[PDB]
């Protein structure tokens, strides 16, 4: 009962979040955004590969769910269930509406046509810009081709054009891979979970002397 995605491909309206004004929104198709070994430490998965949209368009929650499932299945098949971590970087926050018409052989049956045409919430989509990351996969450095293939397969679930880019950052952090090692060595970075905490050279000296100890 869902319309084709070509009817909601473009970012034509203003953002329409589920709020205290827009009520009765059905739940989004995608509820899980992180898959694989999410508890893996930062140094475990040094390689990061992003999938980046080249179009300013709307991606539906069902499309995000399908792409996530496809990428997960290929990554589990190739690199094993604990050899990767995936993060979907798009959340379907924009509600798309439908002005429902009666699909019967009658316009006299209170169809009203375009009168009071403001629609009911049909679904949720995510707005993506040119250069915005849709999915990210971090894994071992030797699984680069597997990451590229998984993202290539996931591309087929989306309307527009997407590029696969192997980032220079270390894992899901915002720091370059070449500088990551010596930054951790000189304790500008402290690992925790899947991320690193940047430790600037300002603040109380008690925080400095709990380090170097």
């Amino acid at each position: 009962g869902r319309r084709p995605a070509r009817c909601y491909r473009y970012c034509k309206n203003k953002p329409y979040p589920k709020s205290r004004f827009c009520r009765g929104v059905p739940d989004a198709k995608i509820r899980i955004f992180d898959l694989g070994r999410k508890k893996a430490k930062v140094d475990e998965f040094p390689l990061g590969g992003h999938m980046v949209s080249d179009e300013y368009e709307q991606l539906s929650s069902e499309a995000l769910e399908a792409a996530r499932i496809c990428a997960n299945k290929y990554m589990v098949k190739s690199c094993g269930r604990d050899g990767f971590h995936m993060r979907v970087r798009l959340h379907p926050f924009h509600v798309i509406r439908i002005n429902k018409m009666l699909s019967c052989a009658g316009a006299d049956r209170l169809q009203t046509g375009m009168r009071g045409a403001f629609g009911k919430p049909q679904g949720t989509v995510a707005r993506v810009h040119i250069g915005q990351v849709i999915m990210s996969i971090r894994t071992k450095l030797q699984n680069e081709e597997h990451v590229i293939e998984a993202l290539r397969r996931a591309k087929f679930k989306f309307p527009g054009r997407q590029k696969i880019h192997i980032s220079k950052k270390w894992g899901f952090t915002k720091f370059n891979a070449d500088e990551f090692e010596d930054m951790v060595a000189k304790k500008c970075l402290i690992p925790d979970g899947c991320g690193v905490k940047y430790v600037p050279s300002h603040g109380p000296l008690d925080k400095w002397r709990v380090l170097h100890s």
């Binding site: 980046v52 250069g131 990351v133 590029k163 880019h165 980032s167």
Partner: protein
């Protein structure tokens, strides 16, 4: 379909700036407004009495009448294809002096001083301010340094 309320659309216009709520500083009350001087109408929202209408916020007028707490201002308002000089009573919280007028009177006084001084000392001097002239000819020394060669950088996708 728009309402005709007196304060429709003034949600941010009459709101206070960030971290500037509370007591109105008293120099605003201590300002002196004579008849004929030029004031800017702003319209702070802490004081709800004597508030100007939203169409006069940001406008500038001339004081014609002074009362205990407010002033009477002749301010131009454009209505369709005509401009008419409205007279509004505005409490002194919502107005301030016009530095454009202040600078102009300073310039007039300084020009009169220059006229008197130059008539005393004979030599003619320029008083009409000119627009920015074209740049005159000048020499640019290299100081024995070759100017740096610039080239466009190669493209790479960053993020």
């Amino acid at each position: 379909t728009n309402t005709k309320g007196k304060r429709r659309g003034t949600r941010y216009m009459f709101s206070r700036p960030f971290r500037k709520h509370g007591v109105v500083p008293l120099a605003t009350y201590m300002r002196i407004y004579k008849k004929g001087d030029i004031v800017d109408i702003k319209g702070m929202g802490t004081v709800q009495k004597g508030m100007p209408h939203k169409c006069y916020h940001g406008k500038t007028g001339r004081v014609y009448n002074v009362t205990q707490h407010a002033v009477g201002i002749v301010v131009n308002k454009q209505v369709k294809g005509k401009i008419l000089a409205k007279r509004i009573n505005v409490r002194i919280e919502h107005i301030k002096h016009s530095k454009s007028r202040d600078s102009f009177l300073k310039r007039v006084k300084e020009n009169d001083q220059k006229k008197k001084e130059a008539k005393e000392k004979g030599t003619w001097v320029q008083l009409k301010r000119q627009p920015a002239p074209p740049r005159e000819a000048h020499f640019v020394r290299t100081n024995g340094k070759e100017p740096e060669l610039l080239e466009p950088i190669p493209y790479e996708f960053m993020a």
